[PDB]
């Protein structure tokens, strides 16, 4: 009708990067199944393949992340603002305020310094794509470095995308490091796995700004800032909290079975927009046991492991759909690689940024979409005079804010 | 544009010289540097729309019957743009080569003592004569910027 | 579903917040019009109406300002990372920059947290409310400051909003400045007029990210980011080129009858929403004779007049329904006031604020939010296979001309 | 001096001069060493440039 | 060095210390001043700090 | 600059330097690069004379 | 001490001035210090005339 709230009624404009197919979990980014391109492929080839439409041949791709290799040179005065922040602070809002200082360092990329002539020419349009698709890997780095109170890294030119990450990630002053070869194949195909989603919040955010004519920089800030909501990224301590309150494995029965007096959470089965399967479910555990290969256990693995092994054989999560989500797998690995909690979103931040780049380019390339004017309609009262607020009656003092200080004003009672 | 420029309402520079005309041998020769320079680092989309343009407005009349031809000034640039030079460095590269110029005049100027600068004669444009009175009958502007200083101590 | 081309269609949201009829020329902020408002109120009454649904009282005016003047504190941290972002770049950007920083220097109101539960308490929502009304002018000021260099000057705590950014502005470093009460009450007045326009992506963008339950400050960033560019309908730069070309008033005909020639461009006159007079553009007229009279003027603003006086009664604006915005008038008194040109936007988002905290809190109040999942039409390719990589086999190359003649345009190592 | 001026001009730190080559091309092996002392000119290149400065000679 | 712990807890830096109050005068002072050498805190607060102090000698 | 020069030279050298810089501390007052047009005000005039007689005898 | 300083005379008052600075930059090397006499100590005279001999080049 005319009232379409959520969305759910209408449709924004089209799109061709991919298509969910949340009821059966058919995923194909341009007809390529996410499994087959997690398994045979790596983080380019998928990001050149959304970002062109269509996969790069060895020349052109080699050449390609030749030069993401080569723009990873962040300016030193967003380190500068790194050191600004106390050390306390949420790893989210540390590289949102780093988007924001690395849109500003830049010139040549604000339209107001020069027109509207920044975004007509597929040169500058692809020269900033591939600064930012590079700085990012970096930035991110400081601030996993100066989270325990650790100096800059330099990133380098010897290695690919995801193994340059696990470099600068742990390289400790030693430019010879090499890390596990292994580790960076598993997080090259995380990044595959967390590519892209069709359009939501932080999606129509990103398309809202890139269509209101802006620095596509500020726009990804935007964008990923939109991605720091807890229903966007926070959903994972639900789960970290379930298997750590949960304590000794000697708990996992009697909790399923608590579980069944609608006494205990759940939380991660079932995907909530897939119901049926996801096959980056079972490639992410052959991936997960290739981790405890390599870097061992824990009891919140084991309590994990065998409370879905309980889990799969109940009922009661056999007929709700309650498979559990890439998010178990997932937070299991990145814990074992050793990252902290509050530095889990950051990471889910770093592949999905290639995707809100391509729709960027895409709505930029069809001007039959054009800028937005939503329709308002006005329930309130249509007209009244204003009074005199003098006059303005005094019968009331409701909502009584009134309390802001610190310690009951003492702060400047002398 | 073509038609533009002959239509005055848009000029057009880059074509020929203020104090040569039948040519300047210098066009021809940056002119086969500037394919050198193609050919040794690559093109740039002004490249491509120099080289369109070069060739473009030779055949319009305009040039038949008003006569520009491409001066130094357009493969310089060009080749500028190409060599990496930043935009605002030019003027400076430019400098470069006038040095020997001023060397040579000095040095020739110091060797030559009958050369005299005199005194230039000059014919007076104002009144012949006027007188001083004291100010304070002085019978009775935009020196200062305002609204910015003023508007602050106003 | 529904196409939905530029989002004009339909109206995805219905709120009671304002009300505005451009054809018709109403702008009634909840039934109250912009006249009767805009001629006598103040900016932090419209602001508290927004914010509550209804005029304040004496003691609430009071207080709330009050509580506005004493939360015009700014951290010193995010003062010291406006300082070390660079000289010359833009200011804009130095605010947002510093709304990022203080989105991370305000980890109590972060609700990654603590839960998607810190934003349901009354009070939590008031305290932000201040703190941002507050806070924001300061930043504004010492960005314009570090364009000029000078030292940031704490806020003084005993003038009006309006004054308070008038003295932050104009100080010169010291105490002993007294407010210009005319020039004060004509921003003050001013600022009614540029409260919460119609929807926009700024407005549905607060209210998605409120819905999301991110905190309130980057949302807040990220609107201010919508705002950055002038292609909002800020065209303020339009008349101004207008005015540097124009010349003296013996040279406009020509440019005059090239519009009616339609050679040349027509800008600030007319409106897209607005069919009609406007009350905006008598009082704002008003306001810049004010400006005109205690500041004076220089020939361009006569050159403006003139052809303001010429035009109005020439019959291709009449019969055109052509006739000057309040951008022409607003950027009239900005520039007579004497402000940087590519400083104005930032003018026109200090006062953009109340409404959008307005609409946040009135979506965060009713629960007629849901999960902003938008839909689409596919129009890909709907399968195709993975090649091997020996089975494979470029629009633009990096770095041309700049560290790659710098590479191999004087050797190879 | 001017190559000082275009390198500074980014805000790199300057260069010492060699002396191992003739006028423009010694210029060029000035322009371009980005800290390694063992660079060369282009001859091509050093012409080019070279032919570029006699043209506005005088 | 105790207000120097208070000071370097939200972030703001030394305070220089001033040097013709009392005792908990100049505690007291050294806490909230901004590095302002134009204030000057309650009596009857620095009072209390002093009463404080001398109820937990030793 | 005048400073950075040793105690032996010539104070108009440094006149003609200081007043080179004064060129350069003034970008916004060039002509050179806003093509011949540009000092067609007599504000900027004004200016001009005003700030040469303001800074030569400082 | 060098590297600014004017040059009125010849460098020997400047060598001067080193070495009487040479003297205090490295306070270990002063018997007046420790005790009442220390170049009574072959160890130290030792270490001291061998450094002396050297010291001058830097």
């Not at chain 2, 640039?77 to 590269?93: K, Q």
């Given at each position: 009708?005319?009232?379409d ?47 062109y439409?269509?996969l ?38 540390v ?26 020419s ?12 590079g ?12 989270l325990?109170?650790?100096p ?67 726009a ?55 119901k ?21 256990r ?33 937070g ?83 | ?32 540097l ?19 343009l ?8 305009y ?66 004569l ?25």
């Amino acid at each position: 009708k005319l009232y379409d709230p959520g969305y759910l009624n209408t449709a924004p404009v089209r799109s061709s990067i991919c298509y969910i197919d949340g009821d059966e979990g058919i995923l194909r980014y341009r007809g390529y199944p996410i499994e087959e391109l997690a398994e045979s492929s790596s983080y380019p080839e998928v990001a050149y393949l959304l970002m062109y439409g269509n996969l790069p041949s060895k020349s052109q791709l080699a050449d390609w992340e030749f030069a993401i290799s080569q723009h990873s040179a962040v300016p030193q005065g967003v380190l500068d603002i790194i050191q600004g922040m106390p050390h306390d602070a949420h790893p989210m809002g540390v590289l949102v305020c780093a988007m924001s200082a690395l849109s500003v360092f830049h010139p040549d990329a604000n339209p107001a310094l020069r027109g509207q002539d920044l975004y007509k020419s597929k040169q500058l349009r692809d020269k900033q794509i591939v600064r930012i698709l590079g700085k990012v890997p970096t930035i991110a780095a400081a601030a996993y470095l100066r989270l325990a109170g650790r100096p800059p890294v330099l990133p380098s030119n010897n290695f690919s995308y995801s193994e340059n990450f696990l470099y600068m990630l742990d390289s400790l002053g030693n430019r010879s490091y090499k890390p596990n070869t292994r580790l960076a194949r598993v997080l090259d195909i995380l990044f595959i796995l967390h590519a892209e989603h069709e359009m939501n919040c932080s999606t129509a955010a990103a398309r809202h700004l890139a269509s209101s004519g802006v620095d596509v920089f500020t726009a990804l800030a935007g964008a990923v800032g939109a991605l720091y909501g807890p229903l966007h990224g926070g959903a994972n301590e639900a789960v970290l909290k379930m298997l750590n309150e949960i304590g000794t494995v000697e708990n996992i029965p009697d909790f399923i079975e608590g579980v069944k007096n609608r006494k205990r959470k759940m939380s991660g089965f079932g995907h909530r927009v897939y119901k049926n399967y996801d096959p980056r479910a079972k490639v992410i555990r052959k991936l997960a046991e290739e981790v405890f290969s390599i870097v061992g256990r824990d009891p919140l693995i084991e309590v994990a492991i065998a409370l879905e092994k309980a889990a799969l054989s109940d009922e009661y999560f056999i007929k709700r759909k309650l498979y559990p989500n890439v998010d178990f797998y997932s937070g299991l690995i990145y814990r074992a690689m050793g990252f902290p909690t509050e530095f889990f979103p950051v990471l889910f931040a770093i592949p999905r940024m290639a995707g809100y780049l391509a729709h960027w380019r895409e709505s930029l390339d069809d001007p039959d979409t054009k800028i937005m004017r939503p329709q308002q309609v006005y329930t309130g009262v249509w007209l009244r005079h204003y009074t005199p607020l003098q006059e303005r009656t005094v019968s009331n003092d409701e909502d009584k804010l009134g309390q802001v200080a610190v310690s009951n004003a003492t702060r400047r009672r002398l | 544009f073509i038609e533009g420029v002959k239509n005055r309402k848009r000029k057009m520079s880059g074509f020929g010289h203020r104090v040569y005309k039948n040519y300047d041998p210098r066009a021809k020769v940056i002119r086969k540097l500037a394919e050198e320079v193609f050919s040794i680092v690559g093109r740039d989309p002004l490249i491509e729309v120099a080289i369109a343009l070069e060739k473009a407005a030779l055949s319009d009349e305009y040039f038949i019957k008003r006569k520009l031809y491409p001066n130094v000034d357009f493969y310089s640039g060009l080749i500028y743009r190409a060599m990496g030079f930043p935009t605002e460095f030019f003027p400076v590269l430019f400098a470069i080569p006038r040095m020997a110029g001023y060397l040579a005049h000095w040095r020739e100027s110091l060797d030559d003592p009958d050369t005299k600068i005199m005194r230039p004669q000059q014919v007076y444009t104002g009144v012949w004569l006027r007188h001083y009175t004291p100010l304070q009958e002085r019978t009775v502007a935009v020196s200062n910027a305002t609204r910015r200083r003023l508007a602050g101590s106003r």
